[PDB]
Structures are given as C-alpha cells and as structure tokens.
Amino acid sequence: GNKICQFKLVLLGESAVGKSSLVLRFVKGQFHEFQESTIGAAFLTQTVCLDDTTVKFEIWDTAGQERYHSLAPMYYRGAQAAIVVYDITNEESFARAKNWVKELQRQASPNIVIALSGNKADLANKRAVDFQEAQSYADDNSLLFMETSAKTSMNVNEIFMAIAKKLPKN
Numbered sequence: 001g002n003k004i005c006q007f008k009l010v011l012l013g014e015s016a017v018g019k020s021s022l023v024l025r026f027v028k029g030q031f032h033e034f035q036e037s038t039i040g041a042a043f044l045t046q047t048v049c050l051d052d053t054t055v056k057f058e059i060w061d062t063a064g065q066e067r068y069h070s071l072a073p074m075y076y077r078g079a080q081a082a083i084v085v086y087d088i089t090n091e092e093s094f095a096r097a098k099n100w101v102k103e104l105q106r107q108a109s110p111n112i113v114i115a116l117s118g119n120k121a122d123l124a125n126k127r128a129v130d131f132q133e134a135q136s137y138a139d140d141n142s143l144l145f146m147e148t149s150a151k152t153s154m155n156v157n158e159i160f161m162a163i164a165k166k167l168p169k170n
C-alpha cells in the first residue's frame with residue numbers, strides 16, 4: 001500500500017533488563033551477549049510494513065541507570081508510545097517498571113500507548129515474576145503486555161508491531 005507514517009517510541013526500564021538488546025533485535029536482527037550499558041540514550045530507526053502502511057519507528061533507547069532518571073522526560077516528551085521493560089528473573093526490576101508506568105501516566109502525553117515487556121523470558125527456569133500476575137497488572141493499567149526474549153527473538157517483532165497497530169488512526 002502507499003501510505004506512510006512515523007512515530008516516536010521510547011524504551012524505559014531498570015539498567016540491564018535488555019532495552020538495548022530488544023531494539024537491536026528489532027532494528028538489526030542482532031543480539032549481543034556483551035552489550036555495554038547505555039549512556040543517556042541511543043537512537044535507532046526501523047521501517048516496517050503494516051497492512052497498507054509503511055511505518056517508520058523513531059526509537060529512543062534510554063539509559064536505565066538511576067543517574068540518568070532526570071533526563072527521561074527529554075526522551076518521553078513527545079513520544080506516541082513507550083515500552084517499559086523488566087527482567088522476568090528480577091522482581092525488583094518489575095517494581096521499577098511499575099514506577100516508570102506511573103511516571104508516564106502522570107507526565108507523558110495523555111494519549112501515549114504503553115507496552116510492558118517481561119524480557120529475558122528464555123530464562124524462565126529462574127523466573128521471579130509470575131506471567132499471570134504481570135498480565136493482570138497490565139490489564140488493570142491498560143498496558144500491552146508480552147514476555148519477550150531479545151536473545152531468541154521471542155515476541156520481539158510482535159510487541160513492536162502490536163504497538164504500531166494500536167496507534168490512533170482516525
């Protein structure tokens with residue numbers, strides 16, 4: 001089809017949950033076991049086919065370390081969507097994700113679409129966050145939830161595409 005559109009997506013979450021890995025998997029079909037912690041933010045783009053539309057994702061991959069918290073609004077101001085990422089093996093990272101969700105609900109655009117990624121789902125033998133508990137949390141907060149693995153690719157294209165399908169369209 002011959003339509004085109006573009007939107008801004010921000011990833012937020014505790015350091016080491018796999019934000020950069022998810023973006024690299026989606027954008028480059030790449031996964032690096034040895035990824036350096038991000039400084040401030042990184043920016044990448046992917047263009048995909050969705051139905052009749054060529055959709056360009058402008059992706060802001062934020063640094064999750066607490067020392068960068070005050071920069072976050074620069075990165076989510078203006079975003080049409082967010083993915084808040086946690087690590088399914090780390091309950092504290094899940095708690096931190098909930099606080100990022102609260103911040104977005106209070107301070108981001110009121111029409112932002114927010115997804116929740118329970119990442120590192122390939123490490124389910126070390127699970128700390130019950131799937132159904134996270135799904136219920138997501139449902140109660142109007143969040144798109146998927147468990148993902150940047151390492152295997154599980155649900156990575158799916159979560160990004162599902163967001164793009166739910167961006168307002170008349």
Ligand SMILES: Nc1nc2c(ncn2[C@@H]2O[C@H](COP(=O)(O)OP(=O)(O)NP(=O)(O)O)[C@@H](O)[C@H]2O)c(=O)[nH]1
Pocket residue numbers: 013014015016017018019020021022032033034035036037038039062063064065119120121122123148149150151152
């Ligand atoms: N097993 C597994 N490891 C993963 C997965 N996603 C990321 N990792 C690993 O987790 C580590 C941290 O990933 P990274 O993408 O740098 O995390 P981040 O959220 O961008 N960290 P920061 O916020 O500090 O930039 C890396 O060693 C990476 O290989 C995944 O789905 N499964």
Ligand SMILES: [Mg+2]
Pocket residue numbers: 019020021036037038061062063064
């Ligand atoms: Mg990173």
